[PDB]
Amino acid sequence: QHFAETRDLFADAVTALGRLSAAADETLSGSNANLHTNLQNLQRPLKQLGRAAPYLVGALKLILTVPFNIDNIPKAIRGDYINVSLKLDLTLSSVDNA
Protein backbone atom coordinates (compact mmCIF):
# COMPACT_ATOMS: atom_id res chain seq x y z
CA GLN A 1 0.00 0.00 0.00
CA HIS A 2 2.81 2.42 0.85
CA PHE A 3 4.60 1.65 -2.42
CA ALA A 4 1.38 2.18 -4.39
CA GLU A 5 1.04 5.55 -2.64
CA THR A 6 4.58 6.60 -3.61
CA ARG A 7 4.87 4.93 -7.04
CA ASP A 8 5.03 8.30 -8.82
CA LEU A 9 7.77 9.52 -6.48
CA PHE A 10 9.80 6.34 -7.06
CA ALA A 11 9.38 6.75 -10.82
CA ASP A 12 10.54 10.37 -10.59
CA ALA A 13 13.55 9.34 -8.48
CA VAL A 14 14.58 6.63 -10.94
CA THR A 15 14.12 8.93 -13.95
CA ALA A 16 16.14 11.70 -12.28
CA LEU A 17 18.97 9.32 -11.38
CA GLY A 18 18.88 8.09 -14.97
CA ARG A 19 19.01 11.63 -16.34
CA LEU A 20 22.09 12.29 -14.21
CA SER A 21 23.74 8.96 -15.02
CA ALA A 22 23.23 9.16 -18.79
CA ALA A 23 25.15 12.43 -19.08
CA ALA A 24 27.67 11.26 -16.48
CA ASP A 25 28.32 8.04 -18.41
CA GLU A 26 28.63 9.82 -21.76
CA THR A 27 31.11 12.32 -20.30
CA LEU A 28 33.15 9.66 -18.48
CA SER A 29 33.31 7.38 -21.53
CA GLY A 30 34.13 10.28 -23.84
CA SER A 31 37.20 11.13 -21.73
CA ASN A 32 38.30 7.90 -20.05
CA ALA A 33 41.50 7.40 -22.06
CA ASN A 34 42.23 10.99 -23.08
CA LEU A 35 42.39 11.83 -19.37
CA HIS A 36 44.74 8.91 -18.70
CA THR A 37 47.06 9.91 -21.55
CA ASN A 38 46.99 13.57 -20.46
CA LEU A 39 47.89 12.63 -16.88
CA GLN A 40 50.66 10.25 -17.98
CA ASN A 41 52.12 12.98 -20.18
CA LEU A 42 51.82 15.74 -17.57
CA GLN A 43 53.39 13.69 -14.76
CA ARG A 44 56.93 14.53 -15.89
CA PRO A 45 56.40 18.32 -16.23
CA LEU A 46 54.73 18.26 -12.81
CA LYS A 47 57.81 16.61 -11.27
CA GLN A 48 60.15 19.09 -12.98
CA LEU A 49 58.01 22.06 -11.92
CA GLY A 50 58.03 20.70 -8.38
CA ARG A 51 61.82 20.60 -8.54
CA ALA A 52 61.83 24.19 -9.85
CA ALA A 53 58.94 25.49 -7.72
CA PRO A 54 61.04 27.42 -5.13
CA TYR A 55 62.81 29.43 -7.85
CA LEU A 56 59.61 30.11 -9.82
CA VAL A 57 58.63 33.35 -8.07
CA GLY A 58 62.11 34.76 -8.58
CA ALA A 59 62.21 33.59 -12.19
CA LEU A 60 58.96 35.48 -12.86
CA LYS A 61 61.06 38.65 -12.49
CA LEU A 62 62.82 37.68 -15.74
CA ILE A 63 61.23 34.66 -17.46
CA LEU A 64 58.59 36.74 -19.27
CA THR A 65 60.61 39.82 -20.26
CA VAL A 66 64.08 38.29 -20.62
CA PRO A 67 66.36 41.22 -21.66
CA PHE A 68 64.68 43.51 -19.11
CA ASN A 69 63.96 43.08 -15.42
CA ILE A 70 60.48 44.14 -14.29
CA ASP A 71 61.81 45.48 -10.98
CA ASN A 72 63.61 48.47 -12.53
CA ILE A 73 61.58 49.34 -15.64
CA PRO A 74 60.06 52.66 -14.38
CA LYS A 75 63.38 54.31 -13.49
CA ALA A 76 65.54 53.20 -16.43
CA ILE A 77 62.88 53.84 -19.10
CA ARG A 78 61.62 57.42 -18.71
CA GLY A 79 58.76 57.20 -21.17
CA ASP A 80 59.39 57.30 -24.92
CA TYR A 81 63.18 57.03 -24.72
CA ILE A 82 65.42 54.58 -22.85
CA ASN A 83 68.26 56.06 -20.80
CA VAL A 84 71.52 54.17 -21.41
CA SER A 85 75.09 54.78 -20.20
CA LEU A 86 77.62 54.16 -22.97
CA LYS A 87 81.09 52.78 -22.20
CA LEU A 88 82.75 52.96 -25.63
CA ASP A 89 85.55 50.59 -24.68
CA LEU A 90 88.52 50.69 -27.07
CA THR A 91 90.57 48.14 -25.14
CA LEU A 92 92.99 45.96 -27.11
CA SER A 93 91.20 42.73 -26.12
CA SER A 94 87.79 44.19 -26.97
CA VAL A 95 88.95 45.23 -30.45
CA ASP A 96 90.68 41.86 -30.88
CA ASN A 97 87.44 40.01 -30.14
CA ALA A 98 85.35 42.46 -32.19
Binding site: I63, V66, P67, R78, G79, D80, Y81, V84, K87, A98
Partner: protein, 140 residues
Amino acid sequence: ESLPQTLANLEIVIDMLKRYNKNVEQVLVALPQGAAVAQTGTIFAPEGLLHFGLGINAPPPCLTGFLPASQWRSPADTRTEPLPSGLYCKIPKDAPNAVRGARNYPCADVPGKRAATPRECRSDEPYQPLGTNPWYGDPD
Protein backbone atom coordinates in the same frame (compact mmCIF):
# COMPACT_ATOMS: atom_id res chain seq x y z
CA GLU B 1 26.72 28.09 -12.96
CA SER B 2 30.50 28.05 -12.37
CA LEU B 3 31.83 24.57 -13.21
CA PRO B 4 30.32 24.64 -16.74
CA GLN B 5 31.91 28.05 -17.29
CA THR B 6 35.23 26.85 -15.85
CA LEU B 7 35.21 23.88 -18.23
CA ALA B 8 34.17 26.05 -21.19
CA ASN B 9 36.98 28.52 -20.50
CA LEU B 10 39.53 25.73 -20.07
CA GLU B 11 38.31 24.29 -23.38
CA ILE B 12 38.75 27.69 -25.06
CA VAL B 13 42.29 28.07 -23.70
CA ILE B 14 43.28 24.53 -24.69
CA ASP B 15 41.81 25.06 -28.16
CA MET B 16 43.82 28.26 -28.62
CA LEU B 17 46.95 26.43 -27.46
CA LYS B 18 46.25 23.58 -29.90
CA ARG B 19 45.81 25.97 -32.84
CA TYR B 20 49.17 27.52 -31.82
CA ASN B 21 51.13 24.41 -30.86
CA LYS B 22 54.18 25.17 -33.02
CA ASN B 23 54.52 28.63 -31.46
CA VAL B 24 54.56 27.14 -27.95
CA GLU B 25 57.13 24.55 -29.03
CA GLN B 26 59.36 27.26 -30.52
CA VAL B 27 59.15 29.33 -27.32
CA LEU B 28 59.97 26.32 -25.13
CA VAL B 29 62.97 25.68 -27.38
CA ALA B 30 64.17 29.30 -27.31
CA LEU B 31 63.88 29.84 -23.54
CA PRO B 32 66.82 27.71 -22.22
CA GLN B 33 69.14 29.11 -24.87
CA GLY B 34 67.96 32.56 -23.82
CA ALA B 35 68.97 31.74 -20.25
CA ALA B 36 72.38 30.61 -21.51
CA VAL B 37 72.71 33.80 -23.58
CA ALA B 38 71.92 36.00 -20.58
CA GLN B 39 74.36 34.02 -18.42
CA THR B 40 77.08 34.50 -21.04
CA GLY B 41 76.38 38.21 -21.53
CA THR B 42 76.28 38.94 -17.78
CA ILE B 43 79.79 37.77 -16.89
CA PHE B 44 80.55 41.30 -15.67
CA ALA B 45 77.95 41.84 -12.96
CA PRO B 46 77.38 45.65 -12.93
CA GLU B 47 77.57 46.15 -16.73
CA GLY B 48 76.18 43.95 -19.51
CA LEU B 49 77.68 43.87 -22.99
CA LEU B 50 75.88 45.71 -25.80
CA HIS B 51 77.89 46.41 -28.96
CA PHE B 52 77.28 48.82 -31.83
CA GLY B 53 77.05 48.04 -35.53
CA LEU B 54 79.23 49.80 -38.06
CA GLY B 55 77.84 50.88 -41.42
CA ILE B 56 75.52 53.81 -42.13
CA ASN B 57 71.97 53.41 -43.47
CA ALA B 58 72.44 49.82 -44.65
CA PRO B 59 68.74 49.09 -44.15
CA PRO B 60 66.83 52.37 -44.03
CA PRO B 61 64.14 52.15 -41.34
CA CYS B 62 60.55 52.46 -42.51
CA LEU B 63 58.18 55.18 -41.31
CA THR B 64 55.09 53.70 -43.02
CA GLY B 65 52.44 52.42 -40.63
CA PHE B 66 54.07 54.11 -37.62
CA LEU B 67 53.48 57.37 -35.79
CA PRO B 68 53.98 60.51 -37.92
CA ALA B 69 57.07 62.61 -37.27
CA SER B 70 54.98 65.66 -36.33
CA GLN B 71 53.40 63.53 -33.57
CA TRP B 72 56.71 62.74 -31.84
CA ARG B 73 57.31 63.97 -28.29
CA SER B 74 60.43 65.64 -26.92
CA PRO B 75 62.63 63.44 -24.67
CA ALA B 76 62.16 65.82 -21.72
CA ASP B 77 58.65 64.60 -20.85
CA THR B 78 58.78 61.49 -18.67
CA ARG B 79 54.97 61.46 -18.77
CA THR B 80 53.50 58.19 -20.02
CA GLU B 81 50.88 58.09 -22.77
CA PRO B 82 48.43 55.42 -23.99
CA LEU B 83 50.25 53.18 -26.44
CA PRO B 84 48.43 52.93 -29.80
CA SER B 85 47.49 49.67 -31.50
CA GLY B 86 47.99 48.45 -35.04
CA LEU B 87 51.48 49.90 -35.49
CA TYR B 88 53.91 48.08 -37.78
CA CYS B 89 55.91 48.64 -40.95
CA LYS B 90 53.61 48.85 -43.98
CA ILE B 91 55.90 48.18 -46.96
CA PRO B 92 54.70 45.72 -49.66
CA LYS B 93 57.31 43.11 -48.63
CA ASP B 94 59.81 44.92 -50.87
CA ALA B 95 63.51 45.65 -50.22
CA PRO B 96 65.82 43.90 -47.72
CA ASN B 97 64.48 46.28 -45.06
CA ALA B 98 62.22 44.69 -42.42
CA VAL B 99 61.92 41.36 -44.24
CA ARG B 100 60.95 39.46 -41.08
CA GLY B 101 58.63 42.18 -39.78
CA ALA B 102 55.05 41.79 -38.60
CA ARG B 103 53.47 41.38 -42.05
CA ASN B 104 55.51 38.21 -42.75
CA TYR B 105 54.52 36.34 -39.59
CA PRO B 106 53.07 32.89 -40.40
CA CYS B 107 49.40 32.32 -39.60
CA ALA B 108 49.14 29.17 -37.49
CA ASP B 109 45.43 28.46 -37.99
CA VAL B 110 45.28 29.56 -41.65
CA PRO B 111 48.02 27.84 -43.68
CA GLY B 112 49.65 29.62 -46.60
CA LYS B 113 49.19 33.20 -45.42
CA ARG B 114 51.33 35.78 -43.61
CA ALA B 115 49.82 38.73 -41.76
CA ALA B 116 50.70 40.87 -38.77
CA THR B 117 47.78 40.07 -36.45
CA PRO B 118 45.41 37.08 -36.22
CA ARG B 119 42.55 39.53 -36.76
CA GLU B 120 44.13 40.02 -40.20
CA CYS B 121 45.18 36.37 -40.56
CA ARG B 122 41.54 35.28 -40.27
CA SER B 123 40.05 38.18 -42.23
CA ASP B 124 39.75 37.43 -45.95
CA GLU B 125 40.07 41.07 -47.04
CA PRO B 126 43.33 41.27 -49.03
CA TYR B 127 46.38 42.66 -47.25
CA GLN B 128 47.43 45.89 -48.89
CA PRO B 129 50.38 48.01 -47.69
CA LEU B 130 49.82 51.57 -46.56
CA GLY B 131 52.64 52.67 -48.87
CA THR B 132 56.21 52.22 -50.06
CA ASN B 133 58.67 53.90 -47.70
CA PRO B 134 60.18 56.92 -49.51
CA TRP B 135 63.38 58.84 -48.86
CA TYR B 136 61.77 62.29 -49.13
CA GLY B 137 59.09 62.24 -46.46
CA ASP B 138 55.35 61.71 -46.83
CA PRO B 139 55.41 58.00 -45.86
CA ASP B 140 51.59 58.11 -45.29
